[PDB]
């Protein structure tokens, strides 16, 4: 493992220090349909005319990004994305900007979100959840190895590719940091106690998120939910969790150590780092090497109805894409 990571670090570094820019243009893409929306942007299926390929184009409104004070976060996302490379991270193929927007063109994953499949099915069996969780485990070991904190693990940010494997999306909160950070960021149900308390935190909040993910995948609902955020934060810090009766003893053990409010005992943040996770009973049947290569049998294959098929995605109201005659936030996004 140390071998692979060492070289992965060398490649990321070169790209990090010399990020690619303006590698495409809006008019080289055919706007097909909206696959999702966010506070300051949207993602659409697009078709690259020269190659006939489909991609997921993320369009960010520079003015909204500024109003929401996510300028640096948006710069973090593209800079990081153009530099990383892992089998469970969706690839940033092209990036560019125009008068009104920033654009990040990623590889399209027709399979759809884990969220959709998870909600419809209810809950995943333990081997099913173990297969996806394992992929997140290698992805986090990879990211943290590069001094990156992800900060938004959740089913809504996980896609299922043609091979049944996971593809992580949304690096809007990713950040390269050695040492503590304080930005309050994430999703209510997945926030670690440190974040809600405003106490400076590290990569350990990613490992706590994994604990929330595994629990939600195996139970059908998150360990901490309520109709309003403040109620959800009250549960998270209380250091009190309840487990469904069908949760194996090993599964409950792994989660007790993951959903540890005391980030001095929390698995992943210990002296043995990620190994305390990879070597936990619940993962004894897991062949970490096999999972990376993807030679492990996937429990679910979301067969699609052809390339460019958006059947596995929900519908969203279509928004017209306009580009003003004037440049809006040049200085702010000069390095994009």
């Amino acid at each position: 493992v140390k071998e692979f990571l060492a070289k992965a670090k060398e490649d990321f570094l070169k790209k990090w220090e010399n990020p690619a820019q303006n590698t495409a243009h809006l008019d080289q893409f055919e706007r097909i349909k909206t696959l999702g929306t966010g506070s300051f942007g949207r993602v659409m299926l697009v078709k690259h005319m020269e190659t006939g390929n489909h991609y997921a184009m993320k369009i960010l409104d520079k003015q909204k990004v500024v109003k929401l004070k996510q300028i640096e976060h948006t710069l973090n996302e593209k800079r990081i994305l153009q530099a990383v490379n892992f089998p469970f991270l969706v690839k940033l193929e092209f990036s560019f900007k125009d008068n009104s927007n920033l654009y990040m063109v990623m590889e399209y994953v027709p399979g759809g979100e884990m969220f959709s499949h998870l909600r419809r099915i209810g809950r995943f069996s333990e081997p099913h959840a173990r297969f996806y969780a394992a992929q997140i485990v290698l992805t986090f070991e990879y990211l943290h190895s590069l001094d990156l904190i992800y900060r938004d693990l959740k089913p809504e940010n996980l896609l299922i590719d043609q091979q049944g494997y996971i593809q992580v999306t949304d690096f809007g909160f990713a950040k390269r940091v050695k040492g503590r950070t304080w930005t309050l960021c994430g999703t209510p149900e997945y926030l670690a106690p440190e974040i809600i308390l405003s106490k400076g935190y590290n990569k350990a909040v990613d490992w706590w998120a994994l604990g929330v993910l595994i629990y939600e995948m195996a139970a059908g609902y998150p360990p901490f939910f309520a109709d309003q955020p403040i109620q959800i934060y009250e549960k998270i810090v209380s250091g009190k969790v309840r487990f469904p009766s069908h949760f194996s003893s090993d599964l409950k053990d792994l989660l007790r150590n993951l959903l540890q409010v005391d980030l001095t005992k929390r698995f992943g943040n210990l002296k043995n780092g990620v190994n305390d996770i990879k070597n936990h009973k619940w993962f004894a049947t897991t062949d970490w090497i096999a999972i990376y290569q993807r030679k492990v049998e996937a429990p679910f294959i979301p067969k699609f109805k052809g390339p460019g098929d958006t059947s596995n995605f929900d519908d969203y109201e279509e928004e017209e894409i306009r580009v003003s005659i004037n440049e809006k936030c040049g200085k702010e996004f000069s390095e994009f």
Partner: peptide, 20 residues
């Protein structure tokens, strides 16, 4: 059941991120 409570809650849909 907790499953029932969850499904009846307002947080079964896509959850938005927070920051400000």
């Amino acid at each position: 059941t907790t499953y029932a409570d969850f499904i009846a809650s307002g947080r079964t849909g896509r959850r938005n991120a927070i920051h400000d």
